[PDB]
Design a protein around this ligand. Structure first.
Ligand SMILES: *[C@@H]1O[C@H](CO)[C@@H](O[C@@H]2O[C@H](CO)[C@@H](O[C@@H]3O[C@H](CO[C@H]4O[C@H](CO[C@H]5O[C@H](CO)[C@@H](O)[C@H](O)[C@@H]5O)[C@@H](O)[C@H](O[C@H]5O[C@H](CO)[C@@H](O)[C@H](O)[C@@H]5O)[C@@H]4O)[C@@H](O)[C@H](O)[C@@H]3O)[C@H](O)[C@H]2NC(C)=O)[C@H](O)[C@H]1NC(C)=O
Ligand SMILES: *[C@@H]1O[C@H](CO)[C@@H](O[C@@H]2O[C@H](CO)[C@@H](O[C@@H]3O[C@H](CO[C@H]4O[C@H](CO)[C@@H](O)[C@H](O)[C@@H]4O)[C@@H](O)[C@H](O[C@H]4O[C@H](CO)[C@@H](O)[C@H](O)[C@@H]4O)[C@@H]3O)[C@H](O)[C@H]2NC(C)=O)[C@H](O)[C@H]1NC(C)=O
Ligand SMILES: *[C@@H]1O[C@H](CO)[C@@H](O[C@@H]2O[C@H](CO)[C@@H](O[C@@H]3O[C@H](CO[C@H]4O[C@H](CO[C@H]5O[C@H](CO)[C@@H](O)[C@H](O)[C@@H]5O)[C@@H](O)[C@H](O)[C@@H]4O)[C@@H](O)[C@H](O)[C@@H]3O)[C@H](O)[C@H]2NC(C)=O)[C@H](O)[C@H]1NC(C)=O
Ligand SMILES: *[C@@H]1O[C@H](CO)[C@@H](O[C@@H]2O[C@H](CO)[C@@H](O[C@@H]3O[C@H](CO)[C@@H](O)[C@H](O)[C@@H]3O)[C@H](O)[C@H]2NC(C)=O)[C@H](O)[C@H]1NC(C)=O
Ligand SMILES: *[C@@H]1O[C@H](CO)[C@@H](O[C@@H]2O[C@H](CO)[C@@H](O)[C@H](O)[C@H]2NC(C)=O)[C@H](O)[C@H]1NC(C)=O
Ligand SMILES: *[C@@H]1O[C@H](CO)[C@@H](O[C@@H]2O[C@H](CO)[C@@H](O)[C@H](O)[C@H]2NC(C)=O)[C@H](O)[C@H]1NC(C)=O
Ligand SMILES: *[C@@H]1O[C@H](CO)[C@@H](O[C@@H]2O[C@H](CO)[C@@H](O)[C@H](O)[C@H]2NC(C)=O)[C@H](O)[C@H]1NC(C)=O
Ligand SMILES: *[C@@H]1O[C@H](CO)[C@@H](O[C@@H]2O[C@H](CO)[C@@H](O)[C@H](O)[C@H]2NC(C)=O)[C@H](O)[C@H]1NC(C)=O
Ligand SMILES: *[C@@H]1O[C@H](CO)[C@@H](O[C@@H]2O[C@H](CO)[C@@H](O)[C@H](O)[C@H]2NC(C)=O)[C@H](O)[C@H]1NC(C)=O
Ligand SMILES: *[C@@H]1O[C@H](CO)[C@@H](O[C@@H]2O[C@H](CO)[C@@H](O)[C@H](O)[C@H]2NC(C)=O)[C@H](O)[C@H]1NC(C)=O
Ligand SMILES: O=S(=O)(Nc1cccc(-c2nnn[nH]2)c1)c1cc(Br)c(Cl)s1
Ligand SMILES: *[C@@H]1O[C@H](CO)[C@@H](O)[C@H](O)[C@H]1NC(C)=O
Ligand SMILES: *[C@@H]1O[C@H](CO)[C@@H](O)[C@H](O)[C@H]1NC(C)=O
Ligand SMILES: *[C@@H]1O[C@H](CO)[C@@H](O)[C@H](O)[C@H]1NC(C)=O
Ligand SMILES: [Zn+2]
Length: 857
């Protein structure tokens, strides 16, 4: 880079793009493409060079176009992904110029950038498909551009395809001219002002189902064989689109909106303006073969991706340090829209579980402020983590419960209007709230520690007569104050309940209770991003109540108490026995949210013990939890009867009983599976129990082979994923290895399912070591397919490491990562992984001998 005219990661500010015209001629059979982009730019400062982004481009020609065309010289700096155009005459300030670069390139074999893949039809024909995934930083691999989100421009896109293939892009199509040799050239209309990471184009054989919605054509695309499965998606997109245009008070601005089920896609979906793109398993749906977890997944993702058309596309963060302004808003709007127009799905259970898991991570010293400087490519990819998504929506949810829902909307609508087709940073949002409260509250001041400081506060609560003493401190095990909007509910001696709110912006304070009260619970429904720790008498009060009658608290409040007690046991604020004391109430619980959280704490302790060789202790622990839930597990029916939350409770209890061979569930499941196999896979299996039935079946070599045959045979991808979870839960190490190797190479299983497979293998005893070895031995190939730092990698590092609980393993994991580049060693997921092992070591030090005692007999 020493003879390159630019020394920094971030492009200069002296030249800005106005309009791109991109012409691509891709070849899916040779996996290459020819390109010619033409950029109109304006120079704001006198410069001799244009610094631009480009990787993997064999550039044949560069010309400064006018009348007279001037050839220009081009320099490359691949370490920074940058190229430098040397101008023949200096670019003057206040002038604009038009640049043209003709180039050729390979189509990607990764999931990043303009990538191409191959699939097999039902008629057993091989088919070719090409698609884009640019966010965060791959647009530059497709065409030269100013590949930073603040450089918003307009795009005209042109594709030369073979006539059998459809070409979609962000904007509607304008023209189609038929050329020689079976080729068409599709031209698309010029786009709105957008960032380069949103540009998208697809080439593949696809059918469509469309509906006009008030002048905007809404279409669902999929390969021809799956087109019968897009109806639900179409219905749901219409509902959410009219809900969002109403709540935001800004119409969706493009004449069409496409949603595309891509046969091979790593993310769950991508929010490209006008061309939303999804995994097949996250868009297609069939009530006959898809569980209610599947339904809810399709509807969540749609809600999330549609919300990005306003939060992210219309209004974009200036730089990736504020990614949470896109992803936090989209995740809030996803779960908010679901509670207003799809209450029945009880999506709040999903949002609550996700916040519980984000908080465990956010509690580690390897956590970062949700707004953190990032400059390196891997630092940018790592910004796509749970904090951006679920601590960002928790910040919004804390504000929405604090201020009115009406105040919140006012601020949202004002924010989006002011900043349409432009860029924003954190303070711009805190301003819009300040304007809506007519500057009474200083939102910018209150939101400071939540935005700039990692972690969350521990609120400690003690009752003294008719008052509550409240304090706050940082939640950590070896820092500024937070402005904490506190909520409490309390039951009086006349058995009357009251709730109120108070804002703790100092270290300590006293809440005046107007009466004397039986118990008190702070942080209603965990609408605040903090953990609450009670004095001993005040835990006991809440525990005594849960045994007498748990239903004076909501089911979110009860899930919150189980999560907080166990997380406070890890910290050491309460002995582990008090956690177990609390979930002894579970005999009277029959709601999903609390049972789900108890089973997770239970299963996490089981999976830890099992790896350490304490197979006896683990099993004692599940049999004690089984007795607590015995009545609930035995009521369960093997059907799809009931509300969504009851169907989800059914799957959790039958999965927990079958997995630990408790009761006769094993036997019921084997009988149902064996009758399924006799039918040759044609008998009705209830969707709710299909994971569980398959898993039991996959434990024999006959049933394993049978399941595999239908995996490569059936048309329901959601059913295929239940088969894959059952296949990957075999105890036959040869088969597990064969499953990972196969997904990694793209044969039979697609590389998109690898993270799922690796994690399933690594969760149980047979594959535990196997999965971590596959990760270590295939690290370099993994990082060819998935970018270093991205969520797929974070998910693989975490899922293969987090059940290690020995000093030896700690040093192994650390030393393996030190043998990689510093960029790899200093990845946040790698550091978080090392801290989680260290906490396992200490948790076992503190709690093992006493756990052996309460399970003695
Ligand atoms: C990327 O590089 C490619 C390599 O140079 C380039 O060339 C294209 O390559 C692909 C892949 O090989 C070809 O697609 C395949 O085409 C064949 C043959 O298609 C022709 O024949 C069929 C039917 O006749 C066949 O029938 C029997 C069995 O039925 C065969 O045994 C027999 O030998 C015959 O091949 C016919 O239906 C096709 O007609 C199509 O196109 C015409 C106009 O071109 C239309 O009138 C018609 O409606 C129809 O759409 C065709 O004449 C086929 O068997 C495969 O299934 C597959 O379709 C391309 O044909 C080939 N193109 C050319 C011009 O050579 C790619 O073009 C290049 N891509 C880009 C974007 O540049
Ligand atoms: C999760 O768990 C909670 C707690 O167990 C459930 O709530 C309970 O639901 C049961 C339903 O079986 C309730 O029991 C019902 O009692 C009703 C009337 O109670 C009055 O009368 C009894 C004596 O009969 C007194 O003890 C009491 O003080 C009341 O004054 C009955 O009407 C019900 O029987 C009905 O069904 C049968 C057969 O269908 C009919 O033949 C009858 O005519 C009658 O209509 C039933 O016995 C219990 O009271 C509830 N308790 C609480 C605390 O809520 C939730 O339902 C459960 N949730 C889920 C999703 O499973
Ligand atoms: C069960 O027993 C309880 C006993 O507390 C009964 O509830 C109380 O009922 C009495 C009589 O009706 C109420 O007394 C009245 O209170 C009026 C004030 O109402 C508003 O303020 C209350 C408290 O305000 C102070 O405290 C809070 C918390 O620190 C601060 O934020 C405020 O700024 C104040 O300093 C709220 O509880 C209430 O909902 C209103 O917001 C007052 O104007 C009247 O003149 C009278 O004094 C008493 O407020 C009730 N207490 C509570 C906690 O609700 C209940 O009725 C009994 N059960 C049955 C069935 O009757
Ligand atoms: C450099 O290139 C820019 C970009 O094209 C030129 O600026 C452009 O100027 C025209 C007007 O001369 C703008 O069009 C206007 O649009 C508004 C509303 O959309 C309309 O009311 C006007 O009647 C007019 O049509 C245009 O928006 C503006 N920029 C862009 C990005 O479109 C500029 O003139 C060129 N030359 C120089 C010396 O800078
Ligand atoms: C697939 O999409 C096309 C549009 O791209 C649909 O055919 C169009 O129908 C719309 C209204 O639904 C009209 O605005 C267009 O003029 C039609 N175009 C053509 C070329 O006929 C078609 O209906 C969609 N397929 C399904 C099954 O809905
Ligand atoms: C259906 O489309 C029309 C036209 O796009 C919408 O009317 C627009 O509403 C916005 C918001 O107030 C105005 O800024 C435009 O000027 C209106 N356009 C026209 C032509 O009147 C209409 O709101 C849409 N339907 C719904 C339910 O929102
Ligand atoms: C927690 O992590 C922080 C940073 O992630 C560590 O703080 C650094 O400590 C070194 C000590 O040599 C300093 O050079 C750095 O400046 C510190 N970073 C910051 C941001 O101040 C700290 O060591 C860790 N703490 C614990 C208890 O593990
Ligand atoms: C629109 O957004 C602009 C930012 O472009 C807001 O301007 C900020 O306003 C606050 C409070 O007045 C100031 O402290 C900032 O310094 C301003 N920023 C800039 C860059 O000027 C403006 O408040 C918003 N307008 C409306 C009508 O809401
Ligand atoms: C805490 O709340 C209690 C109950 O509302 C307050 O006690 C009341 O105080 C008012 C105002 O002085 C008196 O008129 C009543 O006689 C009291 N009621 C009862 C039932 O005792 C107390 O003043 C509050 N303290 C603070 C610091 O706000
Ligand atoms: C059970 O289902 C399987 C599909 O997994 C069937 O296997 C197919 O059978 C037909 C002919 O019967 C062949 O044309 C296909 O190629 C087979 N698919 C394969 C082997 O992957 C099987 O036939 C079904 N059982 C019965 C009794 O019909
Ligand atoms: O691949 S995703 O699984 N797809 C996806 C996209 C949007 C929202 C959700 C969601 N909603 N509720 N829970 N998750 C999931 C994922 C990527 C990153 Br970065 C995450 Cl954080 S999640
Ligand atoms: C670059 O493109 C030129 C012109 O098409 C071609 O001759 C040359 O082989 C290409 N080089 C590489 C390394 O792709
Ligand atoms: C395309 O791939 C081949 C094989 O890896 C490589 O030699 C060539 O340089 C690639 N093209 C570009 C433009 O990098
Ligand atoms: C299992 O035992 C329960 C009683 O706990 C009984 O109702 C059920 O029928 C039994 N299941 C089978 C398959 O025998
Ligand atoms: Zn998103």
């Amino acid at each position: 880079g020493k003879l390159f005219p630019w020394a920094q990661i971030r492009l200069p500010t002296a030249v800005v793009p106005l309009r791109y015209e991109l012409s691509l001629h891709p070849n899916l059979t040779s996996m290459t493409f020819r390109g010619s982009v033409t950029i109109s730019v304006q120079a704001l400062q006198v410069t001799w060079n244009i610094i631009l982004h480009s990787t993997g481009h064999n550039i044949s020609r560069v010309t400064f176009m006018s009348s007279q065309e001037k050839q220009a010289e081009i320099l490359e700096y691949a370490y920074h992904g940058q190229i430098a155009i040397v101008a023949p005459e200096a670019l003057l300030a206040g002038h604009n110029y038009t640049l043209k670069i003709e180039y050729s390139a390979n189509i990607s074999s990764s999931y990043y950038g303009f990538y191409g893949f191959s699939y097999t039809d039902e008629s057993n024909e091989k088919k070719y498909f090409a698609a884009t995934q640019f966010e965060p930083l791959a647009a530059r691999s497709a065409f030269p551009c100013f590949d930073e989100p603040a450089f918003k421009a307009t795009f005209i896109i042109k594709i030369i395809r073979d006539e059998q293939y459809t070409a979609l892009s962000n904007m509607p199509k304008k023209s189609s001219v038929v050329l020689d040799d079976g080729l068409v050239q599709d031209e698309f209309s010029e786009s709105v002002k957008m960032s380069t990471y949103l540009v998208a184009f697809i080439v593949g054989e696809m059918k469509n189902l469309s509906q006009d919605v008030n002048g905007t054509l809404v279409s669902i695309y999929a390969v021809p064989e799956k087109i019968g499965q897009v109806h639900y998606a179409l219905e749901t997109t219409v509902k959410l689109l009219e809900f969002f245009q109403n709540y935001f008070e800004i119409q969706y601005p493009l004449k069409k909106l496409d949603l595309v089920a891509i046969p091979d896609f790593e993310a769950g979906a991508m929010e490209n303006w006008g061309l939303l793109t999804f995994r097949e398993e996250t868009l297609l749906y069939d009530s006959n073969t898809s569980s209610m977890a599947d339904r809810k997944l399709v509807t969540k993702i749609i809600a999330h991706e549609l919300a990005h058309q306003w939060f992210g596309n219309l209004v974009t963060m200036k730089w990736w340090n504020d990614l949470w302004l896109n992803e936090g808003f989209a995740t809030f709007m996803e779960y908010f829209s679901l509670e207003k127009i799809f209450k029945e799905l009880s999506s709040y259970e999903d949002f609550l579980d996700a916040r519980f898991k984000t908080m465990k991570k956010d509690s580690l010293n390897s956590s970062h402020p949700i707004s953190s400087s990032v400059q390196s490519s891997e630092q940018i990819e790592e910004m796509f983590d749970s904090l951006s998504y679920f601590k960002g929506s928790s910040l919004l949810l804390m504000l929405k419960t604090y201020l009115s829902e009406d105040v919140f909307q006012h601020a949202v609508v004002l924010y989006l209007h002011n900043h349409s087709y432009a860029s924003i940073q954190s303070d711009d949002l805190w301003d819009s709230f300040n304007e809506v409260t007519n500057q009474t509250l200083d939102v910018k001041r209150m939101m400071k520690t939540w935005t700039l400081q990692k972690g969350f506060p521990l609120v400690t609560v003690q009752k003294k007569g008719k008052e509550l003493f409240i304090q706050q401190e940082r939640f950590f095990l070896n820092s500024y104050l937070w402005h904490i909007p506190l909520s409490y509910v309390t039951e009086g001696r006349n058995y009357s309940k009251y709730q109120s709110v108070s804002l703790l912006d100092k270290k300590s304070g006293v809440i005046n209770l107007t009466e004397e009260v039986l118990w008190v619970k702070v942080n209603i429904n965990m609408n605040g991003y903090y953990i609450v720790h009670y004095a001993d008498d005040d835990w006991e009060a809440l525990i005594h109540q849960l045994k007498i009658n748990p239903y004076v608290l909501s089911d979110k409040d009860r899930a919150n108490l189980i999560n907080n007690i166990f997380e406070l046991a890890g910290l050491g604020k309460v002995p582990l026995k008090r956690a177990f004391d609390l979930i002894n109430y579970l005999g009277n619980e029959n709601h999903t949210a609390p049972i789900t959280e108890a089973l997770f704490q239970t299963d996490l302790i089981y999976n830890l013990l099992e790896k350490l060789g304490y197979m006896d202790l683990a099993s004692r622990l599940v049999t004690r939890v089984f007795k607590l839930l015995q009545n609930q597990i035995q009521q369960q029916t093997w059907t799809d009867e009931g509300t969504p939350s009851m169907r989800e409770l059914r799957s959790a209890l039958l999965e927990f009983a079958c997995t630990h061979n408790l009761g006769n569930c094993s036997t019921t499941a084997m009988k149902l599976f064996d009758d399924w196999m006799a039918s040759n896979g044609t008998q009705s299996l209830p969707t709710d129990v299909m994971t569980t039935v398959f898993k039991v079946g996959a434990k024999t070599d006959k049933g394993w082979s049978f399941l595999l045959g239908k995996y490569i045979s059936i048309g329901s991808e959601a059913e295929k994923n239940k088969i894959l979870e059952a296949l990957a839960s075999s105890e036959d190490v040869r088969k597990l290895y064969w499953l990972m190797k196969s997904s990694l190479n793209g044969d039979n299983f697609r590389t998109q399912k690898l993270s799922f497979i690796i994690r399933t293998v690594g969760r149980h005893f047979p594959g535990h070591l196997l999965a971590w070895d596959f990760v270590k031995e295939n690290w370099n190939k993994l990082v060819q397919k998935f970018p270093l730092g991205s969520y797929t990698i974070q998910n693989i590092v975490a899922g293969s490491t987090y059940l290690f609980s020995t000093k030896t393993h700690l040093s192994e994991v650390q030393a393996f990562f030190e043998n990689q580049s510093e960029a790899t060693f200093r990845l946040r997921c790698v550091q978080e992984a090392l801290e989680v092992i260290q906490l396992n070591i200490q948790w076992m030090e503190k709690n093992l001998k006493s756990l052996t005692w309460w399970l003695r007999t």
